[PDB]
Structures are given as C-alpha cells and as structure tokens.
Ligand binder design. Sequence first.
Ligand SMILES: CN1CCN(c2ccc(Nc3nccc(-c4cc5c([nH]4)CCNC5=O)n3)cc2)CC1
Length: 340
Amino acid sequence: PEMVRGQVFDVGPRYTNLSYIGEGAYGMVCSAYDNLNKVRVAIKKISPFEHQTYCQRTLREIKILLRFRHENIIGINDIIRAPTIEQMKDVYIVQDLMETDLYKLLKTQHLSNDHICYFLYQILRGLKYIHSANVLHRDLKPSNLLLNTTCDLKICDFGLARVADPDHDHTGFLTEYVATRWYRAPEIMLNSKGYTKSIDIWSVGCILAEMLSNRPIFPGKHYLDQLNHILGILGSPSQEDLNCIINLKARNYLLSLPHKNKVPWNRLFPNADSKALDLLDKMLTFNPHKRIEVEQALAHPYLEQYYDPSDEPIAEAPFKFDLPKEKLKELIFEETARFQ
Ligand SMILES: CN1CCN(c2ccc(Nc3nccc(-c4cc5c([nH]4)CCNC5=O)n3)cc2)CC1
C-alpha cells in the first residue's frame, strides 16, 4: 500500500507513481498514473466514517458528480474502496488531473483580459448546468476552480451543494454559516440560509474582481466584518433594498450605520474593461432579487465572443429534492458499488 506523507494510499495496483498535491477539509489529493488508461489522474482520498457531517458531504458529492456530465465540471473516473462494508474505512475519488487551480494561479500570475473573459465564461457556462439541475454549489472560490495547461477550467467540491429552496431561505440576523467568509453574499449575514441561485452569482462576482486585481475584494476577518467591507464598496443600501429586509434585527443594524457612498468600480479597477466592470456591477448587487441570473451573465456583451446558447448544455434530469453516521455509510457503499 503506497504511503504518501505519513498516510496510506490503497489505490493500487491500477494506480501507481503517487505524488502529493495537497490536503485540507476535503481530504488528501494526489496525482497517480492510471496504468489502465496510460495517463496521469488525480486521486482524492477521503475518510468520513467517524463524523456524520463528513459522511453526508461525501454522499452529496458522489451523487451529484455521478449524475453531472459537463466539460466545465470535474467528473469521477473511478471509485476505490473496500469490497465489503466492514473493511470500508476510506474512500478514493479518481478524477481528471489538472495543472493548477485559480487560487494558486492568482497568487503568482497576472491574468490577461482574454484569460479573464475565457475563465469567467467557463465559470458561468458550467454554473448554468449546475443551476438548470436545481442545484447550488455554495462554495465557489478560486481553490474550487481547476485549470489545465490549455486554460480549460473546471468547477470542484460539491460537498456543500444543495437543491434550491427559495421558500425556506429566510433566517434570523447573523445565523451560523459555513461557505467561505470572503465569497459570502450580503444576505447571508442578514436574513438568508443560502438556498437561492443568487448566492452563487455573488461568489462568481467576487472571483471576477479577484481576477482583475489579484486581491480579494471583501476580505472580512469574521462574520460581520465581511458585511462591513461589502458596504464600504457598495455603499449604504437604498430604501427599496431595506424595505426588502423584513427581519428587524438586520434592518435595524443597517439603519444604525452611518451613510457610506459607493466606491466606483472604475476607481478600484481603473485598468479593467468597461464591460467586465458593468457585469461585475450586476453580479455584485446588494439586493438578491435584482442580482443578475447565470443566463443573463452569459448573454452580457462582455462575453459576446463566446456566448452560444446551443453550446451551453443544461441538465437532462434535475434533482427533485434534497440520519445516523451508520446509515450514511451504507448509502455511500451502495453508491460506490458501480465501480467494484
Ligand atoms: C499549491 N498547490 C499546487 C497544486 N495545485 C493543484 C490543484 C489541482 C490539481 N488537479 C486536480 N485534479 C482533480 C481534482 C482536484 C481537486 C479536487 C478538489 C481539490 N482539488 C481541492 C478542493 N476540493 C476538491 O474536492 N485537483 C493539481 C494541482 C493546488 C495548489
């Protein structure tokens, strides 16, 4: 059993030549040689059996990716695990090997306007497939966007994905959340559960501004701070947008704040395209109801060279609807039986 960095990697004998790529809350990811397809693939090892949360997460990403088939979404090539459920301690997801991700790329590389336009288009065209299936990613950030040597982009990490529920979206002021603090929509800290498609649009807006400056645009250090910088740039929300917030604690918080004017995008990005900034403006809209939809974003004059309505597929079968840790270990076992 090949061992990488103090950990075991039972992916053999079909997968050899292990090379550590990283670690995190998703698991451990390595690059391996598929002796069967004669190519190098990426293998995500996951050990979610001890905790229920880690178990459902493992289940949500297997179900979704096994059904999703899109050029701008990473897929599952194989699944490796024990043949019996008594010996199943880990799970191994075999996926296409990519060169880098947008997180690493932005840390060192200045992006050209043509690159920004192309990357954004592949983000919206793939997100459109995810939304046509009635699913929300809820974790769109540069680390979840994989790139290859030919600039082909790909979305990652469906563990926090959910079926859209607009009728069950309202919550109290400052309710607990998990999605990264920097790509969090303003309504999340005010009155939302993040069950709407408009939360993904916000995240894509944040990623766009990041590609333009190479610096995060709203880098809040905690839950409320995040809301404060969103307001430093966007300014104090209008009467109309406030009247939209019926939650008293949220509304009253916004009213207690001194007036802040909008920092124009041309001032934050004086070297950006007039169109890219117009689209950014529409994605980063304080009011979730006036925020641009994925199909409208694709049709924006900033993506006219790539925009094809016939070359942007939609999901064949959308998800109809959205337990102990021992139950979720049998669902996974039966979901991964296909690859045995
Ligand atoms: C400093 N590092 C240098 C190397 N970079 C790199 C980044 C990506 C890849 N290829 C690759 N192929 C297939 C899957 C993945 C992958 C799935 C997931 C993640 N990655 C992280 C977040 N959650 C996931 O579920 N990645 C290769 C190298 C990372 C940054």
